[PDB]
Design a protein around this nucleic acid. Sequence first.
DNA 1: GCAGTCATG
DNA 2: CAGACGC
Length: 288
Amino acid sequence: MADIGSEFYTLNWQPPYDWSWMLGFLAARAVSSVETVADSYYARSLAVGEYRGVVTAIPDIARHTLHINLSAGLEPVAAECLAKMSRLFDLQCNPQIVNGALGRLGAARPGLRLPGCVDAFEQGVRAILGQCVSVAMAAKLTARVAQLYGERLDDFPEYICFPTPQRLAAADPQALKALGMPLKRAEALIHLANAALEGTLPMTIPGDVEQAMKTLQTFPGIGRWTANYFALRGWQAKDVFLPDDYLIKQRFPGMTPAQIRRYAERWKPWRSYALLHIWYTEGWQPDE
DNA sequence: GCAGTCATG
DNA sequence: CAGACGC
């Protein structure tokens, strides 16, 4: 927890913002040796193109700003690093507009943001590896993968970079399965890893999001749900909804993934925030 | 044995 | 919209 660098930067955000929740969420998914999450602290390895280093982010609730510290190897691409922190944390969100449009759904915890990511591909590996297993299990799994294919930091030994598209699309489907996953999955990872490497997987949010999710589901191992969750956490698309998610339909007693799909049009263009809310707001119940 | 989610008709 | 693949 000592400064990892001499440069510090300041990112403003619009209140309200539940940082305690945000960090909780990230800490449950923290890939061991890649990220370190504490009380009001978040660190991780980071590669921006060819540059390498470490970010820490520390929230300052009273001044409503986020404090960012960069390792020296990341200084030349600080502007881009901050952009990743902004998308990781959903800092450009206008909560009044969102919670206004969520009405009653937003009232209980207005400081809910959309937990994003730093690298679209990285989220990709996660969205897959997170399939069919507890948040916690995915984390241990992702730890074993990273440790194997991750690239260590020259100046922060204790830290390792999330595996690149390069070293991962070259992974042996058999070495993957051993870390503790079906073979079919090991291939999805490799197929994804290859998409990124040509350019078939969009690294930023596409213009027609709805049409790019279509394209995604063709990928092996990637169904409607995984493609959705990925657009959300991966492209930080704010108008996305999981009518077929189980925990959701558990709140819509006896309804079709179409009876719901339409109910959630009353929350356009902020369906993603609607989704997040219903999930982490247990006391909520729909309008009959 | 029960679900969850990724596949085809 | 209506079969095959870890608790």
